[PDB]
């Protein structure tokens, strides 16, 4: 149902902020973060990719220099695939 976010644009940015904030943690198990890993991809699609550039900002700051990471890489790959189907 999340298609058509054209009226309010800072609150989607804040939710995009907090999911990448608590995507990682030392007090977090894999069975507890699997639902965030399945959550942020369904957030990253069914959305307009214009203001998700403000969080692929911090996608490139820490993850692709690093060889938590797999979910972000899969999200990036699927977002790039959907974009193919500043930012450049």
């Amino acid at each position: 149902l999340f298609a058509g976010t054209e009226h309010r644009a800072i609150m989607v940015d804040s939710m995009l902020h907090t999911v990448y904030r608590l995507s990682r943690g030392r007090s977090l198990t894999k069975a507890q973060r699997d639902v965030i890993e399945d959550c942020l991809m369904a957030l990253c699609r069914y959305i307009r990719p214009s203001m998700l550039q403000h969080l692929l900002r911090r996608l490139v700051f820490d993850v692709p220099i690093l060889n938590x990471x797999x979910x972000x890489x899969x999200x990036x790959x699927x977002x790039x695939x959907x974009x193919x189907x500043x930012x450049x």
Binding site: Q53, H54, R57, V60, X86, X88
Partner: protein, 172 residues
């Protein structure tokens, strides 16, 4: 390193010229929005108490324009050793011709480097204030449309009085 930088005889004039250019630009911007004249500036009537010349203020009144016109110039002198004047120099405060000279291929890079140095200094100040988060290389358009005016004003103010500081498929 801006506080541990050398200050030449041209910096004492360039800081005053940058303060005068900032005051003239601010007065010209306040003259278009129907500003009032008052002793203290308030948000009710939009009073202007700082609509005066640069040489007509005192030490307590130049405290908001002394160090901010000196730290950026010290950072530019520390990034590139260029302290010289080799060209001519160029209430109702009238701003001068700021759109006379276009930016050259080295001058645009110097303005970009001054914006990057100012953004890094602002980020270090914000990190020190948080300890006691935005890069300009991958900034958005909403920040690039707002941060470029300070770099353009600093370049247009440094270009006067002869103080011109001089320094995706193919790659794949």
């Amino acid at each position: 390193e801006t506080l541990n930088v050398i200050i030449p005889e041209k910096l004492d004039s360039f800081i005053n010229k940058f303060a005068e250019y900032t005051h003239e630009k601010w007065a010209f911007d306040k003259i278009q929005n129907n500003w009032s004249y008052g002793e203290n500036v308030d948000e009710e009537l939009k009073t202007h108490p700082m609509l005066r010349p640069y040489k007509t203020f005192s030490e307590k009144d130049k405290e908001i324009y002394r160090w901010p016109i000196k730290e950026s110039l010290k950072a530019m002198i520390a990034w590139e050793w260029t302290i010289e004047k080799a060209r001519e120099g160029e209430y109702n405060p009238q701003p001068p011709d700021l759109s006379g000279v276009t930016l050259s291929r080295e001058l645009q890079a110097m303005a970009e480097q001054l914006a990057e140095n100012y953004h890094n200094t602002w980020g270090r100040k914000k990190k020190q204030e948080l300890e006691a988060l935005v890069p300009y290389d991958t900034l958005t358009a909403k920040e690039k449309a707002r941060d470029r005016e300070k770099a353009q004003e600093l370049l247009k103010f440094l270009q006067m009085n002869g103080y011109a500081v001089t320094r995706x498929x193919x790659x794949x």
